């Protein structure tokens, strides 16, 4: 949280923080969000989070027939909540410099 999350994109560190949790094998998000099992697909994890909290957003998608407004799970809202939960500490202790410490 030392820098603003919006200028990097909430999706890129949602996967990165998910990546670090898998590396530490903590899997604290599995029971927190009621997920079936640990997963690595970032989009599918955010889909479950949006499903869990009932967050939906309508977006414009570029199709071959033109622009279509469809309602989709609110991935940015899911990413922001998922990032906030980790920062609050509900996902357990983390260490981002373990790899550089070992060499």
């Amino acid at each position: 949280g030392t820098v603003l999350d919006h200028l990097v994109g909430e999706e890129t560190m949602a996967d990165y923080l998910l990546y670090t949790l898998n590396k530490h094998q903590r899997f604290g998000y599995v029971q927190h969000y009621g997920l079936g099992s640990a997963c690595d697909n970032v989009e599918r994890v955010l889909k479950s989070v949006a499903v869990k909290l009932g967050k939906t957003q309508k977006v414009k998608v570029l199709t071959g027939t033109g622009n279509v407004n469809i309602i989709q799970p609110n991935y940015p809202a899911a990413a922001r909540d998922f990032l906030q939960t980790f920062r609050r500490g509900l996902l357990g202790s983390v260490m981002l410099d373990l790899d550089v410490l070992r060499g």
């Binding site: 071959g64 027939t65 033109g66 279509v68 407004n69």
Partner: protein
């Protein structure tokens, strides 16, 4: 006994010298006798064969539904729209461009609206047509069929506010896409005095007769 005149032969209202129109029509009749231009309206299915200048003059084909017949003079044009592979395309062909090899009316039909520009916001299958569909036969001495199809529209927003009275569209199921309050709100732009404004109607009856005399005189010569 039904006779049909191509829309571009009737000049727009203005101060242009009629002598220019006479010379423009002479070029049309000289060009028309070489390349036959079949009669068609907006909504008909047209297959146009042209030559691509930068592909070694290879023969080109394109099939689509006519949605607009605008322009006047030798610059008259029509727009064919089709969805190929799932992506919609539009081409504004030129009637008198010598690049055109032949024009074939696959299906001659009329729609409830003069212009089909609202098909862009309509559902994709209302504009998708088979590229190699077999042309259907037209019975001689038969009235031009009129299609009463009311297309279904994609959710708002649209490219243009088709429900407003100025567009005057009668080929859209508005009740399946717009609520009653939205229709009433669009009614505020209605102008009931336009239809009764006698000074803005263009009387072409005296003009079409002159055009027909010129057309038949050239053919006899």
């Amino acid at each position: 006994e039904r006779r049909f005149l191509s829309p571009e032969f009737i000049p727009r209202r203005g101060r242009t010298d009629p002598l220019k129109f006479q010379i423009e029509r002479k070029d049309m009749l000289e060009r028309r006798k070489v390349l036959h231009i079949p009669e068609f309206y907006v909504g008909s299915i047209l297959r146009v064969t042209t030559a691509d200048p930068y592909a070694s003059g290879k023969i080109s084909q394109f099939l689509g539904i006519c949605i607009q017949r605008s322009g006047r003079g030798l610059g008259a044009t029509f727009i064919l729209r089709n969805v190929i592979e799932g992506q919609g395309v539009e081409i504004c062909f030129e009637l008198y461009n010598p690049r055109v090899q032949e024009i074939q009316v696959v299906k001659l039909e009329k729609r409830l609206d003069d212009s089909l520009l609202y098909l862009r916001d309509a559902l994709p299958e209302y504009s998708t047509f088979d590229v190699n569909m077999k042309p259907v036969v037209q019975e001689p001495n038969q009235k031009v069929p009129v299609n009463e199809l009311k297309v279904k529209m994609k959710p708002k927003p649209w490219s243009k506010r088709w429900e407003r009275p100025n567009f005057n569209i009668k080929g859209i199921r508005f009740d399946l896409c717009l609520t009653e309050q939205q229709m009433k709100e669009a009614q505020k732009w209605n102008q009931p005095w336009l239809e009764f404004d006698m000074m803005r109607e263009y009387d072409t009856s005296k003009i079409e007769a002159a055009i027909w005399k010129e057309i038949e005189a050239s053919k006899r010569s």
